[PDB]
Design an enzyme around this catalytic site. Structure first.
Site, mmCIF file in Angstrom:
data_model
loop_
_atom_site.group_PDB
_atom_site.id
_atom_site.type_symbol
_atom_site.label_atom_id
_atom_site.label_comp_id
_atom_site.label_asym_id
_atom_site.label_seq_id
_atom_site.Cartn_x
_atom_site.Cartn_y
_atom_site.Cartn_z
ATOM 1 N N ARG C 66 0.833 -1.193 0.000
ATOM 2 C CA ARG C 66 0.000 0.000 0.000
ATOM 3 C C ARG C 66 0.875 1.253 0.000
ATOM 4 O O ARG C 66 0.455 2.293 -0.500
ATOM 5 C CB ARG C 66 -1.008 0.003 1.158
ATOM 6 N N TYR C 70 0.183 4.632 -2.261
ATOM 7 C CA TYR C 70 0.135 5.992 -1.749
ATOM 8 C C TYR C 70 1.140 6.854 -2.514
ATOM 9 O O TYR C 70 0.815 7.966 -2.925
ATOM 10 C CB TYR C 70 0.333 5.961 -0.229
ATOM 11 N N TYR C 92 -12.551 11.177 1.205
ATOM 12 C CA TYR C 92 -13.752 11.013 2.003
ATOM 13 C C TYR C 92 -13.411 11.351 3.453
ATOM 14 O O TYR C 92 -12.296 11.104 3.913
ATOM 15 C CB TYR C 92 -14.332 9.612 1.776
HETATM 16 N N1 LIG Z 1 -18.067 4.846 7.407
HETATM 17 C C1 LIG Z 1 -17.169 4.555 8.345
HETATM 18 N N2 LIG Z 1 -17.603 4.117 9.551
HETATM 19 C C2 LIG Z 1 -16.693 3.824 10.488
HETATM 20 N N3 LIG Z 1 -15.367 3.898 10.427
HETATM 21 C C3 LIG Z 1 -14.967 4.336 9.222
HETATM 22 C C4 LIG Z 1 -15.779 4.675 8.159
HETATM 23 N N4 LIG Z 1 -15.017 5.085 7.075
HETATM 24 C C5 LIG Z 1 -13.781 4.988 7.495
HETATM 25 N N5 LIG Z 1 -13.679 4.546 8.791
HETATM 26 C C6 LIG Z 1 -12.456 4.316 9.547
HETATM 27 O O1 LIG Z 1 -11.378 4.908 8.854
HETATM 28 C C7 LIG Z 1 -10.524 3.874 8.312
HETATM 29 C C8 LIG Z 1 -10.065 4.273 6.931
HETATM 30 S S1 LIG Z 1 -8.856 5.620 6.938
HETATM 31 C C9 LIG Z 1 -9.839 7.005 6.303
HETATM 32 C C10 LIG Z 1 -10.441 7.867 7.397
HETATM 33 C C11 LIG Z 1 -11.261 9.051 6.874
HETATM 34 N N6 LIG Z 1 -10.404 10.007 6.120
HETATM 35 C C12 LIG Z 1 -11.909 9.777 8.059
HETATM 36 O O2 LIG Z 1 -11.810 11.021 8.089
HETATM 37 O O3 LIG Z 1 -12.479 9.070 8.913
HETATM 38 C C13 LIG Z 1 -11.362 2.603 8.382
HETATM 39 O O4 LIG Z 1 -10.544 1.439 8.422
HETATM 40 C C14 LIG Z 1 -12.117 2.835 9.692
HETATM 41 O O5 LIG Z 1 -11.322 2.588 10.831
#
Ligand SMILES: Nc1ncnc2c1ncn2[C@@H]1O[C@H](CSCC[C@H](N)C(=O)O)[C@@H](O)[C@H]1O
Ligand SMILES: Nc1ncnc2c1ncn2[C@@H]1O[C@H](CSCC[C@H](N)C(=O)O)[C@@H](O)[C@H]1O
Ligand SMILES: [Zn+2]
Lengths: 262, 49, 262, 58
Positions: C66, C70, C92
């Protein structure tokens, strides 16, 4: 009647979520709690039916428990709900991030059989990651309320970014004072000294509220914290005192070693 | 003044234009010299009184 | 050419900042990393000149670190910046929370003399507090990436709300897999058992990505975690397991006690 | 059809509050088929779409 608490973010006008703004715009009534008069104006242009919660804060050198302050805030919010008004609570940042009013108002609302929810907003924390260019997942993250950390037993992980919120009232038990004392913050330095050297660089952070304003990112040794100029919107960042060390214990269980990490 | 800030904070075109030339953009939105001076010195109080 | 990294939050369309939306709108080119095809359609309507970073993830079950995904993302972003494009990176949630693509792009952009900044957004953690009606201030908050928690030395405070992000790959040291094994999860449990009992209620949380979607809030004893169904978006919440013990030591230095606590 | 609706529903608080009160009605009115509605009411995100990691430890 219904309740929806939203957050407005930290920055004027532009840091609120699209949905959350549309809720303010279509509300019957709005209870505001914003950092300044610029955001309060903006709000009023969004929806002129606003009751400002600031009024319930201690006024005129008055001694009032902040608890009694919040009670009245919740109660006023509930009053509009119980009257049948499509009500919205517009708080600064994230409505539920170190914000008791909203959680108390959602609870009370649901228990009396009303529709209540919380919409997440951009918090001071979220602003700190972007301004300082730090990722809370880098070496981990802990957040505690300065006074709660001083009053009860909290063990920080000195490999993580540590935050202490409401550092400006750190140690102010009464809940009547707007700020703390040097000798309070000095006892915080001696406490922290169990994990952090006196010369450990810390950061006093303040997210901007206005678009023409730069954030406060003031770096100083921990030892000079008691002589620092702190504001109610001040958050204390304490970067890692130590670097990440390998957990041979678990690596062994996983049947691997450091060299095996991708 | 309160009108310029609302725009600026919502509008990423104006924001980027502002960061190109803070003074030119502020003068073009009719901010006074003391107002501009208050921005450049980062004095939020004098802006709020 | 310049760089702005923004977030689109978790929920479709509504959860992005008003300012951040405008950044996408006016951008010369957008590099996206979004949860799904709905979020991808919305973006494309907002600005048609989009490049989807998802492509840089391992395709067709290929072995690929990964780190290398990146690096490629980061390099694509900078390629646009260097060419002289007003470039926007839309990730996101919060673009700089548990996401290293934005921080690296920004860092590298600055060092090449380009303008770069990060606009905070709403994160999965922001979402959690709201969905489970928990104020991170109540007893404080800790976050760690699940694998780093296993591979490195981290001691959690069991009086706080503890989060383990990326639990679906907990102990996947290769960084070439999308998920871990139940044996790994079992090792995690045994490790967590240093603090939390086996019957300790934990929570599998997933914020909804769609307006018509309820969030996942699945409660189970810690022991059961290894059998649980987890997804990449899954976050594990471990609620306090322990009573706050009075910092009698500090209260004394403050010259107070519990009874005086307002 | 489906995408347009969701986009709007996410952004528009009016429509969201309209959807909360009567999800089937609102959805039917926006042209959603029975299968699409059924998937919504059963939470089958998988189907709906038919009809993440960005970091590490170190
Ligand atoms: N819809 C969701 N519900 C719960 N945890 C989430 C999620 N989407 C991302 N995550 C968390 O974030 C991790 C990805 S890393 C990305 C995080 C994102 N940028 C943020 O601001 O949250 C996942 O493995 C999980 O731990
Ligand atoms: N503009 C700002 N910059 C930095 N920290 C801030 C801040 N405003 C509030 N805080 C922090 O939050 C504490 C009050 S708790 C309210 C925080 C708010 N819900 C949010 O979204 O952040 C302050 O004492 C300080 O620690
Ligand atoms: Zn956090």
């Amino acid at each position: 009647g219904s309740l929806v608490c939203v957050g407005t973010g930290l920055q004027l006008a532009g840091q609120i979520s699209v949905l959350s703004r549309s809720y303010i715009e279509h509300a019957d009534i709005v209870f505001s709690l914003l950092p300044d008069g610029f955001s309060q104006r903006w709000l009023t242009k969004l929806n002129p039916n606003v009751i400002n919660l600031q009024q319930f804060y201690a006024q005129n050198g008055e001694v009032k428990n902040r608890r009694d302050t919040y009670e009245q805030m919740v109660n006023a919010i509930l009053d509009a709900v119980r009257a049948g008004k499509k009500t919205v609570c517009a708080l600064y940042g994230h409505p539920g991030v170190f914000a008791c009013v909203s959680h108390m108002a959602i609870t009370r609302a649901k228990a009396e059989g009303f529709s209540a929810k919380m919409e997440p907003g951009i918090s001071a924390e979220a602003c700190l990651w972007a301004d300082l260019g730090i990722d809370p997942g880098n070496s981990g993250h802990q957040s505690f309320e300065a006074s709660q950390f001083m009053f009860f037993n909290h063990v920080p992980d000195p490999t993580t970014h540590l935050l202490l919120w409401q550092i400006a009232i750190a140690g102010e038990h009464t809940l009547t004072q707007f700020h703390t004392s040097s000798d309070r913050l000095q006892i915080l330095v001696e406490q922290l000294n169990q994990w952090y050297p006196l010369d450990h660089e810390v950061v006093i952070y303040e997210a901007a509220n206005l678009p023409i304003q730069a954030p406060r990112i003031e770096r100083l040794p921990l030892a000079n914290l008691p002589q620092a100029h702190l504001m109610p919107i001040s958050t204390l960042l304490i970067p890692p005192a130590k670097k990440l060390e390998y957990n041979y214990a678990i690596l062994a269980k996983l049947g691997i070693g450091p060299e095996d990490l991708g | 003044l309160s009108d310029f800030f609302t725009q600026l904070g919502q509008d990423a075109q104006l924001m980027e234009d502002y960061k190109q030339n803070p003074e030119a953009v502020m003068r073009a939105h009719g901010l006074t010299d003391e107002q501009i001076n208050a921005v450049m010195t980062g004095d939020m109080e004098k802006l709020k009184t």
